[PDB]
Amino acid sequence: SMDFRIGQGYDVHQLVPGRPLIIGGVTIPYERGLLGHSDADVLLHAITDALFGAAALGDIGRHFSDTDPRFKGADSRALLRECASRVAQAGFAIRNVDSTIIAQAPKLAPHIDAMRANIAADLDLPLDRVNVKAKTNEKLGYLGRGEGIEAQAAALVVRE
Amino acid sequence: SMDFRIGQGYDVHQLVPGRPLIIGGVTIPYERGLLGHSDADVLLHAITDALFGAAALGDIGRHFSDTDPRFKGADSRALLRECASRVAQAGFAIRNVDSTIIAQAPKLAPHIDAMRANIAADLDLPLDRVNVKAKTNEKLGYLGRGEGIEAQAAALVVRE
Amino acid sequence: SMDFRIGQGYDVHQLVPGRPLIIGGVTIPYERGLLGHSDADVLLHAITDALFGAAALGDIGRHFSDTDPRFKGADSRALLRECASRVAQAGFAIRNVDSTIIAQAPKLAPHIDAMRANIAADLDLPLDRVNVKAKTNEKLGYLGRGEGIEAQAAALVVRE
Ligand SMILES: CC(C)NC(=O)Nc1nnc(S(N)(=O)=O)s1
Ligand SMILES: CC(C)NC(=O)Nc1nnc(S(N)(=O)=O)s1
Ligand SMILES: CC(C)NC(=O)Nc1nnc(S(N)(=O)=O)s1
Ligand SMILES: [Zn+2]
Ligand SMILES: [Zn+2]
Ligand SMILES: [Zn+2]
């Protein structure tokens, strides 16, 4: 009941024209979107990595081919749910998730609660155990220039 | 007694002429200082965000910046104290904080213990539950060119 | 048995021709290697810092100076083992480590189990409490251009 473990995750994707902008499962109106083989949901990927890492199950690349042509455009919420299923199968219950999105644009405040609800649904958690934070990079670097979006995540689990 | 939660925080600010350099509440001699509407204490901001995240209370931007009369002109220590108040209000106790400052200059080593003492006082924690680390970015990127200073933080809390 | 603490770590080193590439104690064939005073093992440095952080013992630069004769010529595994000894003597047992390497190249997945094996040995941990993840920076910034490699780490300990 006290075999706790922590995990941490990081991800970044380029912002490009002609792609949907999907963050935290939310399709956000914007002239650009994130580039990747999947739907490129940088927030869900970072959380997925934190969960695999807390369970010592490797990482998102190990579990989900980023090159399989059948999976082009994959829904990263389906990947997050399969991650959670494998973490559970390994014997772990999720206690909480925290995360940060770093972007110059668009404004993410109107979308954060929806992201939180998506993640909570996918992890079978109440809202009070999931947190999504959003901020800019204060004009510095490629994030300041709006060339990509970063996400960070932390997860606490317990082996039952 | 076992409802633990983790949070993670990140912040960065530009280094600019004509501002005092204040990190972890410590005024450090230096020809530049951090830019922000606040006093731009990047370390206290990262710790603040980690604490809000561990309590699933959102983030520093949702708590502090509507030109709220109580917080205009507030320094980052007052805001850290208020964050800790709101964490307690939600029924959480803080168990520990860890953090890293990334800066090419100036030398922060002589100031680390004063930062730790300031954070401990603001969070009503013993010293042995607060840690601050500092390193350079090996001359890489905007941190490496001395254009900004980054802070990272992790916090463990428990819902009593 | 319930005095849990969390720590976090970060490191980066430049990647240029002329030095071997050593990560997690593994020598990896590559046309470039990491620059630093010791062996520049960016992954072990980040994990070392997360462990000192969780124990609130400061950081790797305060424990292992480049000037101290005791550690002249010590490689990063020797430093990691001494870190673990100090964490133990401060009264903490390590519960788990998670980490991420960010590099555009080479492919690190073939070397992950070797890194995990080295880390678990140095920390006297079962293999299923040590995790290493690896991903690219999607061609963004100095990491995306192959000009350096970053590592992030998270550690959970408990005071015994
Ligand atoms: C296309 C889907 C099924 N597979 C997928 O998305 N795999 C990934 N592997 N690493 C990633 S990362 N580095 O962007 O978090 S996403
Ligand atoms: C001036 C005070 C009252 N308000 C304030 O400091 N608000 C912030 N919002 N985000 C921040 S961050 N992203 O630089 O940590 S600081
Ligand atoms: C040369 C050995 C004995 N000492 C050593 O390597 N100390 C460090 N201090 N900071 C580091 S960092 N910033 O690259 O993680 S490594
Ligand atoms: Zn991704
Ligand atoms: Zn800030
Ligand atoms: Zn290093």
For every residue of C41-59, which 3-state class applies, written as one string? CHHHHHHHHHHHHHCCCCC
CA dihedral of residues B44, B48, B50, B51 (deg, nearest 10): 130
> Chain B within 8 Å of C31 (Cβ-Cβ)?
no
- Looking up tokens 């904080």 gives B97
Two structure tokens written together for B136? 């350079």
Distance of CA A4 to the CA centre of its chain: 21
Distance CA(A87)–CA(A157), nearest Å, equals 9
Q: Establish whether B11 is an annotated binding residue.
A: yes
Instruction: Give which of C24, C86, C97, C21 is closest to C58, Cα–Cα.
Output: C86
Instruction: Give which of B13, B24, B11, B12 is closest to B112, Cα–Cα.
Output: B24
Distance CA(A41)–CA(A93), nearest Å, equals 24
Q: Is A1 exposed, middle or buried (0-12, 13-18, 19+ CB in 10 A)?
A: exposed
Instruction: Give which of C100, A74, C144, A133 is closest to B46, Cα–Cα.
Output: A133
Stated as kind and residue range, the H or E segment containing B86 is helix B76-89
Q: Which residue of B has its CA nearest to A141?
A: B142
CB-ligand 1 contact for A142 (6 Å cutoff) = no
Which subunits sit against A, judged by 3+ Cβ pairs under 8 A?
B, C
Ligand 3 closest atom vs CA C76 = 6
Residues 50-109, chain B, touching A (beta carbon < 8 A): 50, 52-62
CB B15 within 8 A of CB A138: no
B71-75: long-range contacts at Cβ-Cβ below 8 A with a sequence spacing of 24 or more?
A: B74/B38, B75/B38, B75/B39, B75/B41
- B24 three-state secondary structure: coil
CB B94 within 8 A of CB B159: no
Instruction: Please provide the DSSP assignment of B144-155 as one string.
Output: HTTSEEEEEEEE
Side chain identity at A64, as an amino acid letter? F
Instruction: Give which of A130, A20, A122 is closest to A79, Cα–Cα.
Output: A122
CA angle in degrees (0–180, nearest 5) for C60-C41-A9: 85
Q: Domain limits of chain A?
A: 1-160
What residues in B contact C147, CB-CB < 8 Å?
Answer: 140
Residues forming beta bridges with residue C13, ordered by sequence position = C149
Beta strands C33-34 and C148-159: pairing type? unpaired
Residue-level length of chain B: 160
- Looking up tokens 């994959």 gives A74
Distance CA(C12)–CA(B143), nearest Å, equals 11
CB C48 within 8 A of CB C61: no
Backbone angles phi, psi at B137, to 5 degrees: -105, 25
CB-ligand 1 contact for A5 (6 Å cutoff) = no
Instruction: Give which of C159, C6, C3, C7 is closest to C89, Cα–Cα.
Output: C159
Q: Is C79 exposed, middle or buried (0-12, 13-18, 19+ CB in 10 A)?
A: buried
Q: How many angstroms separate the CA of residue B44 from the nearest CA in chain A?
A: 15
Distance CA(B83)–CA(B51), nearest Å, equals 7
- Largest distance between two CA atoms of chain C: 48
Question: Do B100 and C52 lie within an 8 Å CB cutoff?
Answer: no
Distance CA(B160)–CA(B157), nearest Å, equals 9
- Looking up tokens 């039952």 gives A160
CB B93 within 8 A of CB B158: yes
Two structure tokens written together for C154? 């998270």
Beta strands B26-28 and B3-17: pairing type? unpaired
Two structure tokens written together for B67? 């030109």
Residue A36's contacts (CB-CB under 8 Å, 6 or more residues apart) are: A13, A66, C138
- Looking up tokens 């720590």 gives C7
- CA atoms within 13 A of residue C122's CA, in its CB half-sphere: 26
Distance CA(B128)–CA(B116), nearest Å, equals 9
Instruction: Please provide the DSSP assignment of A29-88 as one string.
Output: --SEEE-SSS---HHHHHHHHHHHHHTT---HHHHS-SS-GGGTT--HHHHHHHHHHHHH
CB A147 within 8 A of CB A17: no
Backbone angles phi, psi at A88, to 5 degrees: -60, -45
CB C134 within 8 A of CB C100: yes
Q: Least CB-CB distance to B134: which of C8, C13, C59?
A: C59
Residues forming beta bridges with residue A100, ordered by sequence position = A133, A152
Distance CA(B49)–CA(B97), nearest Å, equals 12
Beta strands A92-102 and B3-17: pairing type? unpaired
Instruction: Give which of B28, B47, B53, B23 is closest to B125, Cα–Cα.
Output: B47
Ligand 1 closest atom vs CA A79 = 3
Two structure tokens written together for B100? 């890293």
CA dihedral of residues A71, A77, A79, A83 (deg, nearest 10): 180
Q: Least CB-CB distance to A5: which of C99, C112, C156?
A: C156
Distance of CA B62 to the CA centre of its chain: 16
Give A103 Cα–ligand 1 centroid separation in angstroms: 20
Query: Method used for this model?
Result: X-ray
Distance CA(A99)–CA(A50), nearest Å, equals 10
Distance CA(A46)–CA(A126), nearest Å, equals 20
CB-ligand 2 contact for B61 (6 Å cutoff) = yes
Distance CA(B37)–CA(A48), nearest Å, equals 34
Alpha helix (H) ranges present in C55-160?
Answer: 60-63, 76-89, 112-123, 141-144
Distance CA(A115)–CA(B36), nearest Å, equals 28
Query: What does R_g of chain C's alpha carbons equal in angstroms?
Result: 15
Instruction: Give which of B17, B110, A45 is closest to C62, Cα–Cα.
Output: B110
Ligand 3 closest atom vs CA C74 = 3
CA dihedral of residues B33, B38, B44, B47 (deg, nearest 10): -130
Two structure tokens written together for B46? 């990262």
CB C7 within 8 A of CB C157: yes
- Looking up tokens 């309590």 gives B55
Distance CA(A124)–CA(B94), nearest Å, equals 26
Q: Least CB-CB distance to B58: which of A133, A139, A154?
A: A133
Indicate the top mutation candidate among B60, B71, B72, B76 to test ligand 2's pocket, ranked by most ligand atoms within 8 A of CB. Answer: B60
